[PDB]
Design an enzyme around this catalytic site. Structure first.
Site, mmCIF file in Angstrom:
data_model
loop_
_atom_site.group_PDB
_atom_site.id
_atom_site.type_symbol
_atom_site.label_atom_id
_atom_site.label_comp_id
_atom_site.label_asym_id
_atom_site.label_seq_id
_atom_site.Cartn_x
_atom_site.Cartn_y
_atom_site.Cartn_z
ATOM 1 N N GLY A 137 2.022 6.540 9.353
ATOM 2 C CA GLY A 137 3.474 6.705 9.176
ATOM 3 C C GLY A 137 4.299 5.500 9.593
ATOM 4 N N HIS B 32 0.800 -1.240 0.000
ATOM 5 C CA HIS B 32 0.000 0.000 0.000
ATOM 6 C C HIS B 32 0.826 1.279 0.000
ATOM 7 C CE1 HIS B 32 -0.015 -0.030 4.552
ATOM 8 N NE2 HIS B 32 0.390 1.212 4.272
ATOM 9 N N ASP C 121 -0.793 -7.456 1.464
ATOM 10 C CA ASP C 121 -0.130 -6.177 1.659
ATOM 11 C C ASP C 121 1.367 -6.406 1.923
ATOM 12 O OD1 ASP C 121 0.208 -3.481 1.766
ATOM 13 O OD2 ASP C 121 -0.775 -3.209 3.694
ATOM 14 N N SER D 28 3.287 2.250 8.813
ATOM 15 C CA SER D 28 3.080 1.148 7.862
ATOM 16 C C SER D 28 4.325 0.763 7.062
ATOM 17 C CB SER D 28 1.902 1.411 6.942
ATOM 18 O OG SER D 28 2.192 2.413 5.989
ATOM 19 N N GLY D 29 4.406 -0.523 6.718
ATOM 20 C CA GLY D 29 5.537 -1.101 5.990
ATOM 21 C C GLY D 29 6.644 -1.560 6.919
#
Ligand SMILES: Nc1n[nH]c2cc(-c3c[nH]c([C@H](Cc4ccccc4)NC(=O)/C=C/c4cc(Cl)ccc4-n4cnnn4)n3)ccc12
Ligand SMILES: *[C@@H]1O[C@H](CO)[C@@H](O)[C@H](O)[C@H]1NC(C)=O
Length: 236
Positions: A186, A44, A93, A188-189
């Site tokens: 902020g 995403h 994801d 995410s990932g």
């Protein structure tokens, strides 16, 4: 990160900050070093990204403010998004970033081990979420890397909290029933890192949630163990 605390320099050496340079340089997402030329992150993150030319990967960062013109970084050659990915709430994801050059492992930049396929059903008890994300829903990116220890929630319980979604075994949830500690905008990932038999494993990738740190609304993470074959195939 909501209800977290400041990390110390070198505490999470697999953690990276992924920046976009257009029109100006800003943090976009977290990520994890998993190999000498490979970053594991969320699919995403690339929603507003047409090419890897606008990306910079920074390792060894404690403060976002310490990033200056002469701070070294890695370029990105290729973005590999899972071909079944549509939106974070529907899973898949996961994305790989192939770096333009190889990483030299040091105390500041090292890889995190993938979970073992044999540990597929382990319910880890020492899990931490890290990032420069918001401390509350209406905030800004944190200067200093934050960390929070969060318990894993079973798929059955997580499905009960997210009745309007399909929580598959390709997702893993984490959060306190009372709320208070969670990833937020902020983060995410980035990694959900679990220490198992004194070895850190990349158990989850920060993906999505209903608000941040709300009671009975755990954070939802990509369940990395379910993607080990996909990662090994894409990284050769
Ligand atoms: N430079 C920047 N300034 N401001 C910024 C804001 C962001 C931002 C805003 N939103 C995000 C991303 C989604 C995204 C969308 C498009 C491109 C890149 C990323 N989401 C996350 O980071 C985490 C979600 C989350 C995860 C869990 Cl486990 C639990 C609850 C969560 N939440 C529920 N409601 N909120 N979070 N990132 C990034 C950079 C900057
Ligand atoms: C990091 O930034 C904070 C302010 O956000 C500052 O107080 C601190 O001195 C900085 N730390 C380092 C190691 O540069």
């Amino acid at each position: 990160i909501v209800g977290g605390t400041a990390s110390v320099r070198g505490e999470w050496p697999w953690q990276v900050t992924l920046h976009t340079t257009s029109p100006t340089q800003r943090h976009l997402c977290g990520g994890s070093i998993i190999g000498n030329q490979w970053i594991l992150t969320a699919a995403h993150c690339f929603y507003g990204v047409e090419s890897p030319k606008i990306l910079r990967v920074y390792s060894g960062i404690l403060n976002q403010s310490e990033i200056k013109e002469d701070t070294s970084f890695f370029g990105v050659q290729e973005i590999i998004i899972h071909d079944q990915y549509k939106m974070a709430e529907s899973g898949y994801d996961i994305a790989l970033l192939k770096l333009e050059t190889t990483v030299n492992y040091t105390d500041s930049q090292r890889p995190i081990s993938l979970p073992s396929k044999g540990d597929r059903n382990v319910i880890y008890t020492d899990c931490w979420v890290t990032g420069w994300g918001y401390r509350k829903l209406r905030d800004k990116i944190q200067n200093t890397l934050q960390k929070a220890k969060i318990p894993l929630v079973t798929n059955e319980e997580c499905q009960k909290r997210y009745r309007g979604h399909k929580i598959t075994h390709k997702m893993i949830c984490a959060g306190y029933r009372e709320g208070g500690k969670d990833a937020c905008k902020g983060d995410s990932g980035g990694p959900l890192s679990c220490k198992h038999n004194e070895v850190w494993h990349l158990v989850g990738i920060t993906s999505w949630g209903e608000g941040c740190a709300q009671r009975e609304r755990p954070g939802v993470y990509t369940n990395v163990v379910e993607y080990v074959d996909w990662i090994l195939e894409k990284t050769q």
